[PDB]
Design a protein around this ligand. Structure first.
Ligand SMILES: NC(=O)c1cc(F)cc2c1C(=O)N(C1CCN(C3CCC(F)(F)CC3)CC1)C2
Length: 340
């Protein structure tokens, strides 16, 4: 049996569930016959990003129907489906999203196949990630639950949110990596939602930035790591429905430094001198007054009020850093989405 607390065990079971890895591949219409879980590779997914960039190159340079046809055939040969022609940005970005997921799904599966005590404990160790349970009645839980209740958006009213488990997390190497970036202040505790099938990869390797091979557009603020101060904006990237009421989310410590504050999409080739992050400005913001501190870290847990920011792409804020070392992952939440 396992020495880990039941909540930690149930987390490992959820993160390394091989069924749900398969299920999402079916959802993406991958031919599991032509390509099962075992046959996914980094090199395969890498070249598929490159084909997608080539599609976008062609579309912008307005290539001929057969040149676009050739490229789609190459893509669907590299990633066999059970299909949409890739001729516009929207279909290309749909495929990026898939590859991002599959990239993580591959990482999760490579972990189980590696290595030689309960399987649960052996798995936990492959994560190189300290996971401890935060007690329901603790100070951390009171603040976290308030952060959740208060930063739930009014337009995200298709579900109610309930915190089931809260975990203190410490990724191996991350602290040594993060230390120098504490020098810039404006450190804040922020949300990052993702698919459950991604979390094995997220804990093994932390939050990573898009690979250079991937196509450049689709990204509002370039290739960086993206955060929210409203819980539900991040909760939407959990992609949970009826069959999955359980999602996972991260609270991370982000060292924002001097924020380059924007209202419209820009392709951040380079941050301006003395700027260390980007903040997209929403129509709705957490109350600036109600900001709280937790262990030297600012927590924007105020009820979302109307910010006077007009003529902006975004309804809610978002934060983006461009060095992976600027993130320190602190908490992992398990959430029940209670639908209606
Ligand atoms: N992860 C988050 O919680 C999050 C929070 C935010 F406030 C904003 C964002 C995220 C998040 O994950 N974001 C991603 C969502 C996916 N986009 C792009 C979608 C189009 C693409 F072409 F596939 C490139 C990737 C990149 C940013 C934005």
């Amino acid at each position: 049996k396992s020495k880990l607390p039941k909540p930690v065990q149930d987390l490992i079971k959820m993160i390394f569930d091989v069924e749900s890895m398969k299920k999402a591949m079916v959802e993406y219409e991958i031919d599991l016959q032509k390509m099962p879980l075992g046959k996914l590779s980094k090199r395969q997914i890498q070249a598929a990003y490159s084909i997608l960039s080539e599609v976008q190159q062609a579309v912008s340079q307005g290539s001929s129907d057969s040149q676009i046809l050739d490229l789609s055939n190459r893509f669907y040969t590299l990633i066999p489906h059970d299909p949409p022609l890739l001729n516009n940005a929207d279909s290309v970005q749909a495929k990026v999203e898939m590859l991002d997921n599959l990239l993580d799904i591959e990482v999760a599966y490579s972990l189980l196949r590696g290595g030689s005590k309960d399987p649960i404990d052996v798995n936990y160790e492959k994560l190189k990630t300290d996971i401890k349970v935060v007690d329901r009645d603790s100070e951390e839980a009171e603040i976290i639950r308030k952060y959740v209740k208060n930063t739930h958006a009014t337009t995200h009213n298709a579900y109610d949110l309930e915190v089931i488990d809260i975990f203190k997390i410490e990724r191996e190497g991350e602290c040594q990596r993060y230390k120098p970036f504490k020098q810039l202040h404006n450190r804040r505790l922020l949300w990052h939602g993702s698919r459950t099938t991604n979390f094995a990869g997220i804990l093994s390797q932390g939050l990573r930035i898009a690979p250079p091979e991937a196509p450049v557009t689709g990204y509002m603020f370039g290739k960086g790591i993206y955060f929210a101060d409203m819980v539900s904006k991040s909760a939407n990237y959990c992609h949970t429905s009826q069959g999955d009421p359980i999602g996972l989310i991260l609270l991370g410590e982000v060292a924002l430094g001097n924020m380059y504050e924007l209202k419209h999409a820009s392709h951040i080739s380079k941050l301006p001198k003395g700027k260390h992050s980007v903040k997209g400005l929403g129509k709705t913001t957490p109350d600036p007054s109600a900001n709280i501190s937790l262990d030297g870290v600012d927590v924007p847990l105020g009820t979302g009020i109307s910010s006077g920011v007009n003529d902006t792409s975004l309804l809610y804020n978002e934060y983006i850093v461009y060095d992976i070392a600027q993130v320190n992952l602190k908490y992992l939440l398990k959430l029940k989405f209670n639908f209606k």
